[PDB]
Amino acid sequence: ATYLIGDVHGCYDELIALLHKVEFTPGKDTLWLTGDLVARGPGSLDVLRYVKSLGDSVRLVLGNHDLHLLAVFAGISRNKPKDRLTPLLEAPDADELLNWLRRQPLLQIDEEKKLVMAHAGITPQWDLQTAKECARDVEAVLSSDSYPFFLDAMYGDMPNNWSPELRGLGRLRFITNAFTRMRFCFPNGQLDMYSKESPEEAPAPLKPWFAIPGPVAEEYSIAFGHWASLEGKGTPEGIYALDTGCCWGGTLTCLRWEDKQYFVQPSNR
């Protein structure tokens, strides 16, 4: 079976209990994770160790908190106490865990299920081939010896409009925001980087990225995490919002792909 779980945010206890509920069996089963494995929750260190041990029984995409973790580790960015990253940053195997973490994809595609995963979704301004090229480009810089320069360059909110003629730092920033930060879109598809409210509370003319028809969503299902204020609600057919705010006192949600059945683990916080 194929299982998809949203933002774990260090909620190791709830992750293991959810996986025991469905009797997840490495080897017979595969786990897809929407990223943001770390921060906010108490057990970011245990979650990384466990997800890394899954090997090819796990298909991960990196979220914005994963990237922030890598920026702190490399001394690019300052640690926020609220993130509870210190046990992970101070662990003896932190190098091993974070070098593995930076080599993970931004995008996962399964042609047989016609299923696509990214942390925040697929911008409607991208077709599949553009999405893949963009993920390859940012993954290539993240798995390189020079990744702290990228992590520094990535921070920013412009440009917010895709073009195949975007070059250099601006192309990198947009790619990073589209995969890990996107929520709302203007009618033309351009990213809005500031609103994190629910769709009904958002100011016009903002609509959610998935309410704007795009080439990927028309041929593929898309699963994503990231957008907690959506609460997993209000998406169209074929769009699966899996982040139900576990770290925030919501729930950890698992979707089994074969039968589209949901399993829910309440937050222990």
Element (H, E) at 175: helix 168-180
Is residue 7 part of the contact set for Mn ion (CB under 5 A)? yes
Q: Taking contact as CB under 5 A, which single stretch among the options 91-99, 132-140, 226-234, 249-257 is the one that binds Mn ion?
A: 226-234
Is residue 66 part of the contact set for Mn ion (CB under 5 A)? no
Is residue 245 part of the contact set for Mn ion (CB under 5 A)? no
Cα separation, 69 vs 100, whole angstroms: 13
Closest approach, Cβ 221 to Mn ion, in A, equals 20
Q: Taking contact as CB under 5 A, which single stretch among the options 7-15, 26-34, 75-83, 253-261 is the one that binds Mn ion?
A: 7-15
Is residue 36 part of the contact set for Mn ion (CB under 5 A)? yes
Is residue 63 part of the contact set for Mn ion (CB under 5 A)? yes
Structure tokens at 96: 């091993």
- Find residue 185's DSSP bridge partners: 191, 207
Residue 114, Cβ density class (10 Å: 0-12 exposed, 13-18 middle, ≥19 buried) = exposed
Is residue 83 part of the contact set for Mn ion (CB under 5 A)? no
Inter-CA distances, 88 with 19, 37, 69, 146, 162, Å:
22, 12, 10, 22, 35
Closest approach, Cβ 181 to Mn ion, in A, equals 7
Matching residue, tokens 């950890």: 252
Residue selected from 226, 250, 253, 254 as contacting Mn ion according to rule CB under 5 A: 226
Task: Please tell me the count of residues contacting Mn ion according to CB under 5 A.
Answer: 5
Query: Which spans of this chain sit near Mn ion (rule: CB under 5 A)?
Result: 7, 36, 63-64, 226
